[PDB]
Amino acid sequence: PTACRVCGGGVQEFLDLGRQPLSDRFRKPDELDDEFTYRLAVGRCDSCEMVQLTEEVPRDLMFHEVYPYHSSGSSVMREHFAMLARDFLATELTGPDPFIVEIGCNDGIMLRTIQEAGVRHLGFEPSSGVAAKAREKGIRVRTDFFEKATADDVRRTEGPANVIYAANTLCHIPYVQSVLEGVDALLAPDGVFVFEDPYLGDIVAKTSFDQIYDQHFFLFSATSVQGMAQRCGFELVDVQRLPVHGGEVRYTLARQGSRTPSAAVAQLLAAEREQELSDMATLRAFAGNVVKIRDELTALLHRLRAEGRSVVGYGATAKSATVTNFCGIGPDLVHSVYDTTPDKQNRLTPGAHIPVRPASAFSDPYPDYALLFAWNHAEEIMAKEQEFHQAGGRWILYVPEVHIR
């Protein structure tokens, strides 16, 4: 039985994805085939409605010098964060001498615009190789985890932050209480803590179970974020839905009664209550659809092999680990996975051990099918891969349902 990371309440499981490897550990073909596994399963707190995993992977197993994800590899995301940065420069960072702190700045995808504006800033990025890529752009970065203590250090030496921002980062952090204590110590009395992460509403609507893997500890909703804020002295004052990463919410927290919540907060809370998003029965129905997609996807891939049709994957996403290991998909069904990330090329995917090859290798003669694990990047990827589809190759998607197009 598992205690809620936010409130200490009881977490009831509704989905068990089985033994999983680390999502971003790509081994060389010669490397011995052991690896760390953990049980991936998800539950909902009874008190605060926080959806969360029931086993944590230690932070240092996930975030360290070989973290292979470099945010700046997507043009869509580069544009997304530039705009977010400009939006902040125009609103929250108009002070004299404003200060913005980003938790999980990675290769500096967001902070580059802040630095280029001459605004004082600090990235926390415990993963030293991406941290280094950010410093190369001139960005000020601390190779440390953000938590209560390092936030106190930063308050002490740099004074309060007008904005603390985290993208695709807070949901990676089981110790959200120490984070929030750090925000409390660091943030200006009139500041904002803004974070954006994959949205439970979108996961449930699209049955995108591949959004569940080791680094996604929390699947936030407005209902559970409002509860978490309230419980720590903050308040949810705005929400914005975002289409990136398969569907996200950007949550804006201010200290309690410092600002008036936008109409958008009540409206989303009401949609979720109306749709019974976080009712155990809804989440269990989602889990039932998860199994259906597994069963349909494997039936398709085995049918393809029996009809002599070649299948590869496209995008060696962290997400794809959950798919290949839960579904039992390896090299006998999907021969290679094509990917743009140098640190993942000439390696095997975790658990399933499918060879990863450079995307530049996905070329004539094309395979018959490409299983699109990077389905959140469909438009960006398919625009670069017109020749494949023109030649008659087809994509296999499993979100929101198994289908070919």
Ligand X SMILES: Nc1ncnc2c1ncn2[C@@H]1O[C@H](CSCC[C@H](N)C(=O)O)[C@@H](O)[C@H]1O
Ligand Y SMILES: Cc1cn([C@H]2C[C@H](O)[C@@H](COP(=O)(O)OP(=O)(O)O[C@@H]3C[C@](C)(N)C(=O)[C@@H](C)O3)O2)c(=O)[nH]c1=O
Q: Which of 40, 50, 52, 67 binds ligand X (CB under 6 A)?
A: 67
Q: Are 8 and 198 in contact (CB under 8 A)?
A: no
Q: Which of 315, 350, 351, 367 binds ligand Y (CB under 6 A)?
A: 315
Q: Are 77 and 71 in contact (CB under 8 A)?
A: yes
Site membership for ligand X, residue 53 (CB under 6 A): no
**Sign of the alpha-carbon torsion through 27, 32, 38, 40:** positive
Q: Is 270 annotated as a binding residue?
A: no
CB of 186 to ligand Y, least distance (A): 23
Site membership for ligand X, residue 103 (CB under 6 A): yes
Nearer to ligand X, 67 or 395 (CB): 67
Q: Which of 52, 208, 215, 324 binds ligand Y (CB under 6 A)?
A: 215
Site membership for ligand X, residue 169 (CB under 6 A): yes
Q: Is 146 annotated as a binding residue?
A: yes
377 binds, among ligand Y, Zn ion, ligand X, none (CB under 5 to 8 A by kind): ligand Y
Residue 27 and residue 325: Cα distance in Å, rounded? 15
Max CA pair span of the chain? 67
Residue 31 and residue 244: Cα distance in Å, rounded? 35
Site membership for Zn ion, residue 50 (CB under 5 A): yes
The interface region with ligand Y, picked from 12-20, 66-74, 94-102, 183-191 by CB under 6 A, is 66-74
Residue 292 and residue 272: Cα distance in Å, rounded? 24
**Sign of the alpha-carbon torsion through 140, 144, 149, 153:** negative
Q: How many CB atoms lie within 10 A of CB 19?
A: 11
104 binds, among Zn ion, ligand X, ligand Y, none (CB under 5 to 8 A by kind): ligand X
CB of 57 to ligand X, least distance (A): 12
Q: Are 121 and 100 in contact (CB under 8 A)?
A: yes
The CA R_g of the chain, rounded to the nearest whole Å, is 21
Nearer to Zn ion, 48 or 141 (CB): 48
129 binds, among ligand X, Zn ion, ligand Y, none (CB under 5 to 8 A by kind): none
- Could you tell me how many residues make up the chain? 405
**Residues 114-143 close enough to bind ligand Y by CB under 6 A:** none
Site membership for Zn ion, residue 232 (CB under 5 A): no
Nearer to Zn ion, 47 or 72 (CB): 47
Site membership for ligand Y, residue 73 (CB under 6 A): yes
Site membership for Zn ion, residue 301 (CB under 5 A): no
Take residue 56 and report the two structure tokens written for it.
Answer: 């944590």
Q: Are 127 and 135 in contact (CB under 8 A)?
A: no
Tell me the per-residue interface mask from 230 to 269 with ligand Y, x by CB under 6 A, - otherwise: ---------------x------------------------
CB of 51 to ligand Y, least distance (A): 16
Q: How many CB atoms lie within 10 A of CB 3?
A: 11
Q: Which of 52, 127, 162, 168 binds ligand Y (CB under 6 A)?
A: 168
CB of 172 to ligand Y, least distance (A): 6
**Helices 318-327/280-306 angle, 10° precision:** 80
3-state DSSP of 84-148: HHHHHHHHCCCCCCCEEEEECCCCCCCHHHHHHCCCEEEEECCCHHHHHHHHHCCCCEECCCCCH
- Binding residues for dTMP are 69, 319, 339-340, 344, 376-377, 384
- Binding residues for Zn(2+) are 4, 7, 45, 48
- Binding residues for S-adenosyl-L-methionine are 71, 106, 125, 146, 168, 175
- Binding residues for S-adenosyl-L-homocysteine are 71, 106, 125, 127, 146, 168, 175
